[PDB]
């Protein structure tokens, strides 16, 4: 029993983290085979044209360090908002990996790093507004996000920056931003966010599997009538695909999805009346159906 | 910015996890140098005298597997509630390590494992009643808890079992239980718990560092007057050592500890009035002062 925000074991990613320095800027890179991937921000100096900044660089300007071992840069290129530094040494710790872009509402593990040294690991969801609610300080740029499936690391996030509300923005490993953001100082701000309805329902199923039942009721609702309440409370609409994805959790608990939707309607309209669900006094939306199945009985 | 429940990177511990099987019981062991540490439960079969059960075993009865590599057991001994299996091979991935026992109110990272394969990583506090609120299923026995300081792994917890309230119990790596528990099925239950006051104050300092200030007030309280309110709300007493430990966070924020105690008194007496602190609608007590400093600006 028990239900925790649980990260993937980080070892396969730790073996890939390196330090990249250009002039007086140090940040993190990801060393896979003979390439180091890092944010192109590393080449900026006190609205940059990055194509011009990169043409002015030489391989020898990039100081790449894997622990105590300097990696010699033998080529450099720009891919969107990331740099590809070709090095003289293939990483012998390269795991099986893929570069995948994730959807809003999906979760991943963040390996927070500084100076190429991993600091901590935690779970993040990609918000509907394409930000993440992480924990990052100066020097964290180039920290990565990932999921692991059968020892294959699916890298989905490279950290770039903090927005003014204290939420975080970054790119896929192809260097394409999540969301309407750019890798420079502008007045850019997080768009309005919404609650990830399918994830709240997954977490209510986790709560039932773990013996929290107080919020259940004999009532069912329609999908249309549920979606009217969702809109009112700034919840995402629930689709039949969402209902289908919640199939296994519904089967395991014997609680129909639209019966659980009647519970969530009552929680939105009434609150909890001083009660808690899985240790929370709020409705939690950063667990996917897969996160619940991965972890729960 | 941001404040997350953050685990230590788990790689140094992943390289130590192995599978131990005796008869039809499989669980996890910890391989350091030429010894595998595991719960003595592995030798039980359908009130066991473990000294008798162990005298009846041979080295060849223990099947130890490190990934795909069988480790030959060349000696066995019992230390309290753990077994020490001497193997023919020193673990080449053994980190610098210590076996430390932790105090109630301290935190650690759990590497949840199954069949010797790491599954997930998350933070736990040792509760005042010597339980942890983890996430463990059958097969998790022998999963370990640890802190990392400058690449030295301080192992503090080996998982044994779930209690009837769905909280978890285990031992230090010397095999001594945390709390008044035993490694067999009895009617044993978690004792009454309390809230870790010094950790709630640390987390309110984290909240101020991260820009949540709504709960601050111009008032100060005495330590005695604070401790009268603490007792009423089932909070641990606050000691002058606690006030001293909160020194650095007080200095960083310019908020005196007894001024923050006046804020916590108001939160206990009045609640939050529908507001949140660091994304929580409850007072969080599973961050130590060190966890806040480790992570925050
Ligand atoms: C807080 C906080 C910091 C960070 C990451 N940053 C900021 C980098 C951005 C600055 C604005 C323009 C785009 C890149 C760094 O690690 N910066 C160090 C390497 C130089 N994230 O949250
Ligand atoms: C839920 C849950 C399970 C567990 C861990 N257990 C239970 C072991 C205890 C059983 C009672 C007596 C003392 C040992 C196991 O992993 N058991 C598998 C290896 C056989 N923790 O939470």
Which candidate from B119, B211, B297 shows the least CB-CB separation from A137? B297
Resolution in A: 1.2
Residue of B108, B151, B225 lying closest to A117 (CA atoms)? B151
Which candidate from B6, B166, B276 shows the least CB-CB separation from A120? B6
Residues of A in contact with B294 (CB under 8 A): 120
CA distance A208 to A183: 43
CA distance B183 to A290: 32
Beta bridge partners, B277, equal B280
Do the beta carbons of residue A15 and residue A95 sit within 8 Å? yes
Residue B275 burial by CB count (10 A; 0-12/13-18/19+): exposed, middle or buried? exposed
CA distance B179 to B160: 12
Contact yes or no for B121 and A7 at CB 8 A: yes
Do the beta carbons of residue B114 and residue B26 sit within 8 Å? no
Question: Which residues form ligand 2's pocket by a CB distance below 6 Å?
Answer: A 1; B 25, 27, 41, 136-141, 160-162, 183-185
* Structure-token pair, residue B275: 């507001």
Q: How was this structure determined?
A: X-ray
Question: If you measure CA to CA, which chain A residue comes closest to B167?
Answer: A2
Mark B166-199 as b/e (b = at least 16 C-beta within 10 Å).
bbbbbbbbebebbbebebeeeeeebeebbbbbbb
Residue with tokens 């808890």, as numbered in its chain: B145
Residue ranges of chain A that CATH labels 1.10.1840.10: 194-297
* Structure-token pair, residue A256: 């129909």
CA distance B271 to B261: 15
CATH, domain B15-95, list 2.40.420.20, 1.20.1250.10, 2.40.10.10, 1.10.3720.10? 2.40.10.10
Contact yes or no for B4 and A122 at CB 8 A: yes
Contact yes or no for A10 and B11 at CB 8 A: yes
- Is A247 in CB contact (< 8 Å) with chain B? no
CA distance A14 to A9: 10
Who contacts A227 (Cβ-Cβ below 8 Å, separation ≥6)? Answer: A237, A238
Contact yes or no for B137 and A297 at CB 8 A: yes
- Is A134 in CB contact (< 8 Å) with chain B? yes
Phi, psi of B66 (to 5 degrees): -105, 100
Do the beta carbons of residue A14 and residue A153 sit within 8 Å? no
Long-range contact pairs involving A240-246 (C-beta distance under 8 Å, separation at least 24): A242/A197, A242/A198, A242/A201, A245/A198, A245/A289, A246/A198, A246/A201, A246/A202, A246/A205, A246/A289
Residues of A in contact with B135 (CB under 8 A): 1-4, 6, 295
Do the beta carbons of residue A105 and residue A128 sit within 8 Å? yes
Beginning with the edge strand found earlier in the chain, give each strand of the sheet holding A63-66 in spatial order: A69-71, A63-66, A17-22, A25-32, A35-39, A82-87, A73-79
- Is A3 in CB contact (< 8 Å) with chain B? yes
Interface-testing mutation among B122, B123, B233, B274, with chain A (most A C-beta atoms within 10 A): B122
Residue of B168, B152, B133 lying closest to B39 (CA atoms)? B168
CA distance B34 to B40: 18
A141 in catalytic set: yes
What is the number of other CB atoms lying within 10 angstroms of the CB of residue A295?
Answer: 22
| Catalytic residue, candidates A41, A159, A168, A242 | A41
B197-209 and B257-270 are packed helices; what angle lies between their axes, rounded to 10 degrees?
100
Do the beta carbons of residue B97 and residue B120 sit within 8 Å? no
What is the number of other CB atoms lying within 10 angstroms of the CB of residue A191?
Answer: 14
- Provide the sign of the torsion angle of the four alpha carbons A62, A88, A39, A287, taken in this order: negative
DSSP string covering chain A? ------BPP-HHHHTTEEEEEETTEEEEEEEETTEEEEEGGGG------HHHHHHT--GGG-EEEETTEEEPEEEEEEETTEEEEEESS--TTPPEEEE-PPPTT-EEEEEEEETTEEEEEEEEEPPTTS-B-----TT-TT-EEEEEETTEEEEEEEEEEE-TTS-EEEE-TTSPBSSS--SS-SS--PPP--B-HHHHHHHHHHHHHTT--TT--S----HHHHHHHHHHTTBPPPPHHHHHHTHHHHHHHT--HHHHHHHHHHHHHH--TT--BTTBSS------HHHHHHH--
- Closest atom of ligand 2 to B183 CA is 13
Q: After which residues does chain B break, using C–N > 2.5 Å?
A: 46
CATH architecture of A194-297: Orthogonal Bundle (1.10)
Q: Is the CB of A162 inside a 6 Å radius of any atom of ligand 1?
A: yes
Residue ranges of chain A that CATH labels 2.40.10.10: 1-14+96-193, 15-95
Interface-testing mutation among A7, A140, A151, with chain B (most B C-beta atoms within 10 A): A7
Contact yes or no for A5 and B5 at CB 8 A: yes
Residues of A in contact with B120 (CB under 8 A): 4, 6-9, 294-295
* B1-14+96-193, CATH topology level: Thrombin, subunit H (2.40.10)
**Count of CA atoms in the C-beta half-sphere (13 A) of A289:** 16
Contact yes or no for B120 and A8 at CB 8 A: yes
CA distance B181 to B174: 15
CA distance B87 to B85: 6
């Amino acid at each position: 029993s028990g239900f925790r925000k649980m990260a993937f074991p980080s070892g396969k990613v730790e073996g890939c983290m390196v330090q990249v320095t250009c002039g007086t800027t140090t940040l993190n890179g990801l060393w896979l085979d003979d390439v180091v991937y890092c944010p192109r921000h590393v080449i900026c100096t006190s609205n940059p044209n990055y194509e011009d900044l990169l043409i002015r660089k030489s391989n020898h300007n990039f100081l790449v360090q894997a622990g105590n071992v300097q990696l010699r840069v033998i080529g450099h290129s720009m891919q969107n908002c990331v740099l590809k530094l070709k090095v003289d040494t293939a990483n012998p710790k390269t795991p099986k990996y893929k570069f995948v872009r994730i959807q809003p509402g999906q979760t991943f593990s963040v390996l927070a790093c500084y100076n190429g040294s991993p600091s901590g690991v935690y779970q993040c969801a990609m918000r509907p507004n394409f930000t993440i609610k992480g924990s990052f300080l100066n020097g964290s740029c180039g920290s990565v996000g990932f999921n692991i499936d059968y020892d294959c690391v699916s890298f989905c996030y490279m950290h770039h920056m903090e927005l003014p509300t204290g939420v975080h923005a970054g790119t896929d490993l192809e260097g394409n931003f999540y969301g309407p953001f750019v890798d420079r100082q502008t007045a850019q701000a997080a768009g309005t966010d919404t609650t990830i309805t399918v994830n709240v329902l997954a977490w209510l199923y986790a709560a039932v599997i773990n013996g929290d039942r107080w919020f259940l009721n004999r009532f069912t609702t329609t999908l249309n009538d549920f979606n009217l309440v969702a809109m009112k409370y700034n919840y995402e609409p629930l689709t039949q695909d969402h209902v289908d994805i919640l199939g296994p959790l519904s089967a395991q608990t014997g609680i129909a999805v639209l019966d659980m939707c009647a519970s969530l309607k009552e929680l939105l309209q009434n609150g909890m009346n001083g009660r808690t669900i899985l240790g929370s006094a709020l409705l939690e939306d950063e667990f996917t159906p897969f996160d619940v199945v991965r972890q729960c009985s």
